[PDB]
Design a protein around this ligand. Structure first.
Ligand SMILES: Cc1cccc(-c2nc(C(=O)O)c(-c3cccc(Cl)c3)n2-c2cc(Cl)ccc2C)c1
Length: 93
């Protein structure tokens, strides 16, 4: 969906995103957009933030993810919206 070169962007997470990344096994200061996404996805799976019936819907209010994204819920299919929500929380290198 999102172009591969955008997927390959080297990025440095701001402290709060780094913190969520590191609670799901992350061990570095510098990441590609791809690695950020994997780890955020692992967070969502571990914490079971998805709707049982419609599993592409995520609920993230009163949660670190909520703090980062600025929305209470979203569909995981709207990639451009997710990328926009991610970009707020990092520095492109
Ligand atoms: C319910 C749940 C748990 C874990 C991952 C996902 C899930 N399913 C898909 C998908 O595309 O089908 C995606 C996805 C993949 C590539 C880019 C973007 Cl922006 C999102 N994700 C996904 C969603 C978020 Cl918010 C963060 C990371 C991933 C990997 C959904």
């Amino acid at each position: 969906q999102i172009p591969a070169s955008e997927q390959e962007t080297l990025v440095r997470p701001k402290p709060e995103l780094l913190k969520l990344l590191k609670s799901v096994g992350a061990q570095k200061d510098t990441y590609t957009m791809k690695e950020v996404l994997f780890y955020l996805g692992q967070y969502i799976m571990t914490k079971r933030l998805y709707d049982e019936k419609q599993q592409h819907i995520v609920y993230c209010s009163n949660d670190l993810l909520g703090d980062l994204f600025g929305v209470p819920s979203f569909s995981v299919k709207e990639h451009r919206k997710i990328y926009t929500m991610i970009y707020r929380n990092l520095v492109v290198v």
